[PDB]
Design an enzyme around this catalytic site. Structure first.
Site, mmCIF file in Angstrom:
data_model
loop_
_atom_site.group_PDB
_atom_site.id
_atom_site.type_symbol
_atom_site.label_atom_id
_atom_site.label_comp_id
_atom_site.label_asym_id
_atom_site.label_seq_id
_atom_site.Cartn_x
_atom_site.Cartn_y
_atom_site.Cartn_z
ATOM 1 C CB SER A 201 -9.278 0.177 0.508
ATOM 2 O OG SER A 201 -8.809 0.391 -0.814
ATOM 3 C CG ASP B 139 -2.288 0.647 0.983
ATOM 4 O OD1 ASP B 139 -2.265 1.894 0.939
ATOM 5 O OD2 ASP B 139 -3.327 -0.042 0.866
ATOM 6 C CG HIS C 232 -5.464 3.776 1.297
ATOM 7 N ND1 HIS C 232 -4.925 2.607 0.895
ATOM 8 C CD2 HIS C 232 -6.807 3.723 0.945
ATOM 9 C CE1 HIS C 232 -5.873 1.846 0.329
ATOM 10 N NE2 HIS C 232 -7.024 2.522 0.362
ATOM 11 C CG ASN D 188 -13.971 1.216 -3.651
ATOM 12 O OD1 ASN D 188 -14.136 0.085 -3.195
ATOM 13 N ND2 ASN D 188 -13.222 2.118 -3.045
HETATM 14 O O O Z 1 -11.340 1.257 -1.355
HETATM 15 O O O Z 2 -9.196 2.800 -1.262
HETATM 16 O O O Z 3 -10.080 -0.397 -3.264
HETATM 17 O O O Z 4 -8.105 1.068 -3.264
HETATM 18 O O O Z 5 -10.395 2.148 -3.825
HETATM 19 TE TE TE Z 6 -9.758 1.215 -2.261
#
Ligand code: O
Ligand code: O
Ligand code: O
Ligand code: O
Ligand code: O
Ligand code: TE
Ligand code: CA
Length: 279
Positions: free
Chosen positions: A224, A39, A69, A161
């Protein structure tokens, strides 16, 4: 063990019903397992990680998570308050820059890095990789995810998404990994969650409280956020000896809450991740 006033998603993964607020889990808590979070990085100094997180690789000028994130996802895997597997070891691989972007070539290198790097780590109960990322269909990205899985790592990936069929996204569309859709606290498919035959499982993904950079916390939404619930669950179950990296996705599907989600399109599994923990 019981964690009172837990985030709804943690309570959900140890419950046969929505609408409760206590997370129940075996105190082994993923000890002796390892989860790689591939990530934007992980703020390992966050008090919530208790010294159990570290950065092991970056492809950019810093290993710092300048986005948040990756720190959020890592927190859902394994933070003390916000995590599923509260005693796992967390390893950060920064394939995404601080804007959340990354070239597929870098993402592929990061996957092959994890496949090798696990041989430099102590993970007697097993190894998991959480990939809360994706883009358009790529056979090379899917193949990298397939290799990582084949090498003995439980690979969990976000469905995406786009409110669309995950067949058209990678690594979501790789059949051999564990492709994770998102649900909300009322057991609805999250509004944005991808769907389709390639999904293996759903996890909590709408309004998920976890760690953030600057030693903070916040609530965000996405596939996520669902993905690290499943990654943490796998680590937890592997520490218990109930399943293995090769078999954990199937085990999670076998043992899921079945038929309880709404707005699941015809042809998509109706399966919600569940730890089946009984005191
Ligand atoms: O996400
Ligand atoms: O995300
Ligand atoms: O995602
Ligand atoms: O993501
Ligand atoms: O995402
Ligand atoms: Te994501
Ligand atoms: Ca699969």
């Amino acid at each position: 063990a019981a964690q009172t006033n837990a985030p709804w998603g943690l309570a959900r993964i140890s419950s046969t019903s929505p609408g409760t607020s206590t997370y129940y889990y075996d105190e082994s808590a993923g000890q002796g397992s390892c989860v790689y979070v591939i990530d934007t990085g992980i703020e390992a100094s966050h008090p919530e990680f208790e010294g159990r997180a570290q950065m092991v690789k970056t492809y950019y000028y810093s290993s710092r998570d300048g986005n948040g994130h990756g720190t959020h996802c890592a927190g859902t895997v394994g933070s003390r308050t916000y995590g599923v597997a509260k005693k796992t070891q967390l390893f950060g691989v920064k394939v995404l820059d601080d804007n959340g972007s990354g070239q597929y070539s870098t993402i592929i290198a990061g996957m092959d890095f994890v496949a090798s790097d696990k041989n430099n780590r102590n993970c007697p109960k097993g190894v998991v990789a959480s990939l809360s990322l994706g883009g358009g269909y790529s056979s090379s990205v899917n193949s990298a995810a397939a290799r990582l899985q084949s090498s003995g790592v439980m690979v969990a990936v976000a469905a995406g998404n786009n409110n669309a069929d995950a067949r058209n996204y990678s690594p979501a569309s790789e059949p051999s990994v564990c492709t994770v859709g998102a649900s909300d606290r009322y057991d609805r498919r999250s509004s944005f969650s991808n769907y389709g035959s390639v999904l293996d499982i759903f996890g909590p993904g709408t309004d998920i409280l976890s760690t953030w950079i600057g030693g903070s916390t916040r609530s965000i939404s996405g596939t996520s956020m669902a993905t690290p619930h499943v990654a943490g669950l796998a680590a937890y179950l592997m520490t218990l000896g109930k399943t293995t990296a090769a078999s954990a996705c199937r085990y999670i599907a076998d043992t899921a809450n079945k038929g309880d989600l709404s707005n699941i399109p015809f042809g998509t599994v109706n399966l919600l991740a569940y730890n089946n923990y009984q005191a």
